[PDB]
Design a protein around this ligand. Structure first.
Ligand code: 3PE
Ligand code: 3PE
Ligand code: 3PE
Ligand code: DCQ
Ligand code: LFA
Ligand code: LFA
Ligand code: LFA
Ligand code: LFA
Lengths: 162, 100, 129, 322, 467, 300
């Protein structure tokens, strides 16, 4: 169980790093799919089967429309990759790299300072998540439905051609 | 049996990688991709937090996190389509006429 | 127990043998059979005449509005996935919450249908008259 | 290695391997049976010369495909071009890896089940998308866009069609689902769920009338025109494995799976799966192909509210009798 | 625990706003009529405002694991409902000139009001996060409502990207806090504790980053002049009033109900953020020629003053009423100023010497400019006096010195705008008249409650939550 | 004053005008067709669509137009021709139907053959028509000669032309159903075509290009027993046609793909010279077999 979690975590880290430092949009989307598959594998190793199930179910459709928009605008041959290459320079990425590194080491210092007892890996079924979702957490569900409705209304209002 | 610290460190690494892709990348689509990476990393940290305590609260917070992720992705995708329609490029540094 | 590790091993062997079989038939297809040489072999197929431009042009999909609605409706679907597995223990009150949820869902769907969204077909292709 | 637990593990591994080889062989023989059944539907015979009854036609097809040259175009992205047939072959195989064919004969007894099938469908669309984009052809790009529009059409209600079955069974496991149909099959209470899942499952495999990405009349064979050799065969074999997977899943979800009065359970499962396979061929031979905008409008305006109302009515009926 | 009918009695504004959201949706889908949906939104908001009386007659109750309703939630719900009503009233004459559809504006305003009410009633981390996102997303829609205009699209893109980043930061800090404590309730943060542990402190710091973005706090304040200028003027009114009121109310609920507020390090970093916010927001508006960016820096400075009033909550028991009085005065002054700006920007097509053609709007604008400076005979002075008293009581001398310096700088630029209203420069419809009446009552309320502030003190002190 | 006067039957790199009297008719007059690399490249550049010549304006600020060759090698194209589509997404902005790929020089061949020996070339003008293609030529030659054919000749020619009309209509209906998407009725329609072909093989001795009409009559008399096969076909046909109707022509998916699609009125039918089923589908009752009756169609 440790092996699957650690291999999926390493794959997720590598695929995210390849995502943020790539010029090809379709290859970046493929590595993003790989990273989210690895994230769902991490979820499955921790016993949260529903979390990994929703990570593959709803993000396969999310990156699908990302592919649709990439085909819609970004694909132009080598010109788009060449234009994306000029925006990335050694100073340009070395600027915020040390900021991300110092933030990461501060958060790691924070993480290591807490007590630990180990994750037992006991599976949590979708039945318990459904009971808690429609039980103690009513208003989260209802106002999340209203939030998604609001986002849908915003998408309709902005995304019209004419 | 699996340490909580390693899962939180993994989530932190993914979060700072998403922020690196948010800052250093100039095309708006990669900023939205990096935003998706941070929201997935925060959701992942919530699932590790819920799995350490053996509660469904982390999974419910993950559900809310990805509902927000989907809604913000649709809104940002519509805004990016508007930007590409009325500018014909996805340079985010040209959005600077409002200053001072 | 023993059944669980047996099932895990069976699933892992299923994955490994499936991927290896796909790779093996790909390798066998690539290695067997002589190659062909032609002047226009490495040209995209466009019914026998050279292309105008290339196939890497940007193509305006008309269903992008439906796509960014599809993500939202997929998230509503995941909420109903979570509800539907625990209907009996949720009780009638949980049925009331899900009824309100689904009523908001159809209200948004009727709103999308009526305002002209989910309708991207051209005027010449609307089958009028 | 002399222990009951290790030989039980070996027996389970052997059963999973047997299931995998049988379903792959059944996909290839299902291609041959599609040719024969289209002949039967259209007042003809089909291949009945290669061996007795044409039984060696599939072997000659395999030999030709293996010795047809496999090429990668210079204008294509090679990695994605090779990757797409692998996904098309393997995604619905992994979807089939949860189908219980008999009591004691299942590869994975997952607690997610139909969730895993939804994951594999959402991963299977990317094979057609990658094949359409990577080949760098105009017909392929049009086919990939049509496939994306088709996924927009079907994936909204693909899971909500089966949420009635999940609600009736009270669990996500296929074993619990086929055990919940001990008294009556699920086609009778979940009939709107049945027809909506039939529409969505035919749309999953891109089978007729939902063959928008590869419509020969429209896009001149569509997205996989640059594919040839064993990659083209991988696409077709993965499509046929998808047909078998969707048929078996529909049998387990709406027709009890292996439950039957007199015959052995595998005999009933195979009979119902072959019935739905010949129904796939009957649907392909019978009705024409609609326009994909009409398909999207039908999947959004009709099928999705139907699944929502079906889930609401199913919940009301379940809580009324509880 | 289940839901009792008394819980839905206490849930009246949330249910009313959701019901009128659905009703406005169905009326828009039936027929695109601007006046009908506008009247429906105003009717629903007024229905919630008068259902606040029945909520008060019900009592204070912990309605959910998520929500808690008391006088605190009642007061902030009333403030955000008044802000939403004024936003609709200012938006209708602006929307009369919109060539595109004018019906989604009120739907987004109603959904954002629902998010503000849920933020006011929040007693859970999940409720806090959902309320923040439910404030932000309709603001993404409303800021980029006139996307044909370049600046509105600029502000929409900037606000969306920055607020998604801040939501990710806040959610990661939330996850770290939940990993530390194990309960997401507002009363169980650190109950197992030795109150200083690095994981809980880092989680609260990341939530501080997110909320300080949402409260225009330094150094997460750079979006405020840009988003305020780019957005439409009723959207600027709503973002200045309702979002700030709701987010600061839930911030005070979190920092009062949790035992983590007793920690010295969070108080020290909040004092640093408050000092930097006051000085930076006042100094940045010195040479501002545009009224929207000037009001954005004004919002930064006033949220810094609110931060000073919030820091001393653990020591003195009069900090909460100080924040309530300051937020009421700030709401009225911002409503008046942004309403004058909106009425000058209406109808939508696409302030020097304003007294010589529009004298009443100039009077309202100079009254609100006097009020925002903390000058007596106005409500902003009463709020500044409360903030200074709270800072003096808990001995925060750097903060009150910063308040005095920032008040002097604000005096300079506010009074510059006030005299520029009266220098020499080189409608006809009852909705515009209604907006003029709204800003006139705002100015009159500011003047009357500056002269006689005691009834507002009584109403604010009667809005007393569970100590 | 013509907008775009360019070659429509010959390629753009063609010298001379072929229907002039001094132009050689036969391929043996010119050098035999030598396909070299340079000639292949030159003719491929000639066949490449140039949108600037047609004023197609190959771009928009938002997105780029898609130029697609529908044909010559397309299942939807009914021959060797190509429609060049300017597209945005899936929508057609403009079309350039490029023809001339199926040019056999049949008029120049008419100047090259005798009156009797041109009849097989008339048969291949519309290869699903056969005797329907034969009739106008032999009738015009009989007008030239001054020949009035008797009643039996007229009835036999009406028989063969109506048989081939049923054949062509069966192929057209099956082809339409196939392009809508249903691939089954084409097999049965071609079985009915084989029944008609059995009768036509019995009478004329050939399947699809009979070349059986002559100047002043037909090649042979009717063989003994043709009425048996005609009765067999007349018994076999209507049940099959009703089956085709109730199976595919009453299909709501087929109706959705068909009704309202590519619709025009009588004005568009008249200004573009549209004849046949389209002109009558616009409501204009103009059929040659009734308006200007030929070959004794008045007796039917
Ligand atoms: C490179 C190829 C992929 C490598 C990573 C994924 C496979 C790693 C090896 C897994 C081997 C099996 C294993 O370790 O199973 C452990 C556990 C079994 O489940 P559980 O019930 O939690 O365990 C207690 C058993 N009584 O398993 C689990 O809890 C979940 C196992 C991981 C999740 C499934 C596989 C995810 C694959 C992601 C692919 C990403 C793209 C490549
Ligand atoms: C390469 C892959 C090698 C094998 C990886 C491990 C497979 C087994 C596995 O993941 O088992 C974990 C889980 C089954 O556990 P379950 O039986 O539900 O729980 C025990 C009962 N309390 O099963 C699961 O979580 C199954 C779902 C994840 C499987 C992912 C397979 C790859 C999918 C992407 C392909 C591209
Ligand atoms: C194991 C899995 C496999 C199981 C095999 C057996 C089941 C297979 C199911 C196949 C389903 C195919 C569904 C095809 C739907 C096509 C809908 C469509 O696009 O119709 C368009 C057409 C015209 O569009 P319209 O909206 O009228 O025009 C608007 C333009 N202004 O509008 C119309 O034509 C209107 C009528 C639409 C009818 C939709 C289909 C009805 C249900 C499917 C057919 C019956 C399947 C079997 C059911 C059980 C039978 C015992
Ligand atoms: C293989 C299953 C039976 C196919 C039967 C096809 C019958 C003819 C189809 C129409 C058609 C004709 C006449 C035709 O001439 C043609 O051009 C060469 C086509 O494109 C390939 C056609 O599709
Ligand atoms: C054309 C405009 C481009 C703007 C690019 C902005 C890049 C910012 C990079 C910041 C890197 C900071 C590294 C750490 C500095 C020291 C710590 C913070 C300040 C005390
Ligand atoms: C057309 C039928 C397709 C079936 C696909 C799935 C078959 C999987 C292989 C099953 C092999 C084992 C069968 C059951 C064995 C135990 C019972 C024996 C007596 C029936
Ligand atoms: C040089 C003449 C200047 C005339 C200024 C007149 C100002 C009149 C102000 C009327 C009341 C406005 C509100 C004041 C507070
Ligand atoms: C520009 C702002 C200047 C603020 C000065 C504040 C001075 C505070 C001194 C506090 C001394 C406390 C001694 C105990």
């Amino acid at each position: 169980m440790e092996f699957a979690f650690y291999i999926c975590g390493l794959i997720a880290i590598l695929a995210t790093l390849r995502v943020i430092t790539h010029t090809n949009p379709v290859h970046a989307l493929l590595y993003l799919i790989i990273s989210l598959l690895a994230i769902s594998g991490v979820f499955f190793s921790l016993g949260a089967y529903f979390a990994g199930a929703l990570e593959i179910i709803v993000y396969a459709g999310a990156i699908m429309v990302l592919f649709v928009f990439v085909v819609m605008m970004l694909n132009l041959g080598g010109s788009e990759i060449e234009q994306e290459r000029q925006w990335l320079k050694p100073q340009v990425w070395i600027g915020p790299a040390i900021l991300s590194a110092i933030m990461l080491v501060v958060i790691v210092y924070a993480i290591l300072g807490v007590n630990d007892q180990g994750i037992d890996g006991t599976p949590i079924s979708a039945k318990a998540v459904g009971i808690t979702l429609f039980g103690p957490y009513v208003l989260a569900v209802e106002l999340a439905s209203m939030l998604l409705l609001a986002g849908l209304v915003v998408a309709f209002h902005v995304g019209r051609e004419e | 049996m699996i340490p909580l610290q390693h899962g939180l460190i993994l989530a932190a690494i993914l979060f700072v990688l998403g922020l690196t892709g948010l800052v250093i990348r100039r095309n708006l689509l990669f900023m939205l991709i990096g935003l998706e990476i941070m929201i997935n990393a925060s959701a992942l940290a919530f699932v590790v937090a819920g799995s350490y305590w053996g509660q469904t609260d982390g999974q419910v917070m993950y559900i809310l996190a990805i509902s927000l992720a989907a809604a913000e992705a649709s809104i940002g995708l519509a805004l990016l389509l508007q930007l590409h329609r009325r500018r014909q490029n996805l340079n985010i540094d040209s959005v600077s006429e409002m200053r001072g | 127990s023993t059944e669980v590790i047996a099932h895990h091993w069976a699933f892992a062997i299923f994955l490994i043998v499936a991927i290896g079989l796909c790779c093996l038939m790909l390798v066998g297809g690539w290695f067997l059979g002589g190659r062909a040489r032609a002047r226009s072999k490495n040209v995209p197929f466009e019914s026998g005449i050279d292309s105008v431009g290339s196939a890497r042009l940007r193509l305006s999909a008309k269903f992008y509005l439906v796509a960014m609605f599809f993500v939202i409706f997929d998230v509503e679907a995941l909420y109903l996935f979570a509800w539907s597995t625990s209907i009996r223990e949720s009780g009638w009150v949980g049925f009331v919450e899900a009824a309100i949820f689904i009523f908001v869902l159809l209200a948004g769907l009727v709103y999308l249908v009526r305002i002209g969204a989910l309708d991207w077909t051209p005027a010449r292709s609307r089958r009028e008259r | 290695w002399i222990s009951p637990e290790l030989i039980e593990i070996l027996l389970t591994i052997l059963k999973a391997v047997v299931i995998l080889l049988v379903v792959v062989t059944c996909g290839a023989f299902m291609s041959f049976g599609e040719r024969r059944l289209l002949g039967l539907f259209q007042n003809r015979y089909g291949p009945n010369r290669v061996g007795w009854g044409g039984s060696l036609q599939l072997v000659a097809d395999m030999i030709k495909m293996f010795f047809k040259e496999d090429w990668i175009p210079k204008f294509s992205d090679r990695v994605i071009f090779t990757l797409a047939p692998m996904i098309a072959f393997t995604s619905l195989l992994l979807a089939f890896a949860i189908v219980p064919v008999s009591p004691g004969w299942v590869v994975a007894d997952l607690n997610i089940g139909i969730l895993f099938f939804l994951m594999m469908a959402g991963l299977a669309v990317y094979a057609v998308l990658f094949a359409g984009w990577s080949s760098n052809n105009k017909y392929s790009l049009l086919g990939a866009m049509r496939a994306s529009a088709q996924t927009l059409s079907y994936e909204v209600f693909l899971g909500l069609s089966l949420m009635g079955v999940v609600a009736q069974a009270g669990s996500f496991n296929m074993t619990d689902i086929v055990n919940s149909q001990a008294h009556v099959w699920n086609v009778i209470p979940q009939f709107f769920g049945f027809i909506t899942f039939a529409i969505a499952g035919v749309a999953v495999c891109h089978r007729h009338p939902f063959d928008q990405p590869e419509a020969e009349q429209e896009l001149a064979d569509g997205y996989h025109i640059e594919y040839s050799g064993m990659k083209f065969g991988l696409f077709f074999v993965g499509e046929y494995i998808g047909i078998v997977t969707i048929s078996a899943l529909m049998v387990t979800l709406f027709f009890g799976g292996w439950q039957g009065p007199l015959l052995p359970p595998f005999i009933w499962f195979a009979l119902k799966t072959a019935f739905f396979m010949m129904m796939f061929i009957l649907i392909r031979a019978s009705l024409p192909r609609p326009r994909y905008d009409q398909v999207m409008s039908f999947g959004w305006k009709i099928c999705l509210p139907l699944t929502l109302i079906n889930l609401l009515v199913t919940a009301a009926v379940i809580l009324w009798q509880a | 625990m289940t839901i009792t009918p008394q819980n839905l009695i206490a849930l009246l504004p949330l249910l009313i706003v959701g019901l009128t959201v659905v009703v406005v949706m169905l009326s828009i889908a039936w027929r695109r009529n601007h006046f009908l949906n506008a009247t429906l939104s105003v009717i629903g908001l007024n229905a919630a405002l008068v259902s606040l009386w029945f909520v008060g007659q019900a009592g204070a109750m912990d309605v959910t694991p998520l929500m808690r309703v008391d006088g605190f939630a009642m007061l902030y719900t009333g403030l955000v409902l008044l802000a939403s009503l004024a936003t609709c009233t200012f938006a209708y004459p602006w929307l009369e000139g919109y060539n595109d559809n004018k019906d989604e504006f009120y739907l987004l305003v109603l959904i954002a009001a629902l998010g503000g009410i849920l933020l006011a009633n929040a007693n859970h981390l999940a409720s806090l996060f959902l309320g923040i996102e439910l404030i932000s997303l309709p603001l993404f829609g409303l800021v980029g409502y006139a996307f044909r205009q370049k600046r509105s699209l600029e502000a929409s893109i900037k606000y969306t990207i920055l607020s998604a980043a801040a939501s990710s930061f806040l959610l990661f800090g939330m996850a770290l806090v939940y990993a530390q404590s194990g309960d997401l309730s507002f009363v169980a943060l650190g109950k197992n504790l030795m109150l200083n542990e690095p994981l809980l402190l880092a989680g609260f710091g990341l939530m501080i980053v997110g909320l300080g973005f949402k409260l225009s706090l330094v150094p997460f304040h750079l979006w405020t002049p840009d988003v305020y200028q780019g957005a439409p003027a009723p959207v600027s009114t709503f973002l200045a009033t309702a979002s700030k009121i709701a987010i600061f109310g839930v911030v005070m609920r979190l920092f009062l109900y949790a035992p983590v507020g007793d920690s010295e390090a969070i108080r020290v970093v909040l004092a640093i953020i408050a000092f930097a916010s006051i000085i930076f927001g006042n100094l940045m508006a010195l040479s501002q020629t545009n009224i929207k960016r000037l009001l954005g820096y004004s919002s930064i400075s006033h949220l810094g003053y609110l931060l000073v009033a919030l820091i001393a909550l653990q020591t003195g028991e009069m900090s909460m009423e100080a924040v309530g009085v300051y937020l009421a005065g700030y709401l009225f002054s911002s409503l008046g100023a942004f309403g004058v700006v909106s009425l000058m920007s209406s109808p939508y097509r696409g302030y020097r010497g304003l007294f010589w053609h529009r004298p009443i709007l100039a009077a309202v604008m100079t009254v609100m400019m006097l009020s925002l400076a903390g000058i007596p005979m106005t409500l902003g002075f009463i709020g500044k006096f409360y903030v200074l008293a709270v800072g003096v009581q808990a001995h925060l001398w750097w903060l009150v010195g910063a308040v005095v310096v920032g008040s002097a700088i604000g005096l300079y630029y506010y009074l510059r705008v006030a005299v520029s209203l009266y220098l020499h420069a080189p409608p006809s419809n009852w909705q515009y008249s209604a907006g003029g009446i709204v800003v006139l009552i705002s100015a009159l309320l500011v003047l009357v409650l500056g002269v006689w502030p005691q009834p507002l003190i009584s109403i604010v002190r009667l809005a007393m939550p569970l100590m | 004053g013509h907008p775009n006067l360019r070659r429509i039957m010959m390629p753009q790199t063609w010298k001379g005008h072929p229907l002039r009297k001094d132009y050689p008719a036969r391929a043996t007059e010119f050098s035999p067709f030598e396909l070299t690399k340079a000639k292949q490249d030159l003719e491929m550049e000639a066949l490449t669509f140039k949108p600037e010549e047609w004023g197609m304006k190959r771009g928009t600020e938002n997105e780029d137009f898609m130029f697609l060759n529908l044909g010559p090698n397309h299942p939807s194209a009914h021959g060797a021709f190509r429609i060049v589509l300017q597209l945005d997404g899936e929508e057609i902005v403009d079309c350039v139907p490029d023809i001339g790929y199926h040019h056999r020089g049949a008029e120049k061949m008419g100047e090259r053959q005798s009156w009797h020996s041109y009849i097989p070339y008339t048969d291949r003008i519309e290869y699903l028509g056969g005797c329907v293609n034969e009739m106008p030529y032999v009738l015009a030659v009989e007008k030239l000669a001054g020949i009035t054919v008797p009643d039996r000749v007229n009835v036999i020619r009406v028989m063969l032309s109506e048989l081939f009309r049923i054949n062509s209509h069966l192929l057209y209906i099956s082809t339409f159903i196939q392009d809508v998407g249903a691939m089954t009725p084409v097999f049965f329609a071609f079985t009915d075509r084989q029944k008609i072909y059995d009768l036509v093989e019995a009478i004329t001795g050939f399947r699809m290009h009979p070349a059986w009409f002559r100047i002043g009559g037909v090649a042979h008399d009717l063989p003994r027993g043709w009425d048996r096969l005609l009765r067999e076909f007349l018994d076999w046909m209507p049940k099959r046609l009703a089956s085709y109707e109730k199976a595919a022509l009453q299909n709501t998916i087929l109706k959705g793909r068909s009704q309202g699609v590519a619709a025009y009125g009588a004005k568009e039918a008249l200004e573009w010279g549209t004849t046949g089923a389209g002109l009558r589908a616009t409501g204009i009752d103009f059929d040659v077999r009734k308006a200007r009756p030929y070959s004794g169609y008045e007796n039917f």
